[PDB]
Amino acid sequence: GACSDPRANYDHPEIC
Numbered sequence: 230g231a232c233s234d235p236r237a238n239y240d241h242p243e244i245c
Contacts (some may be wrong), residue, residue: 230245231237237244 232245234245
């Protein structure tokens with residue numbers, strides 16, 4: 230996953 234990471238955002242629908 231990536232929700233635990235600040236890498237996911239609303240800017241990136243590809244991540245969590």
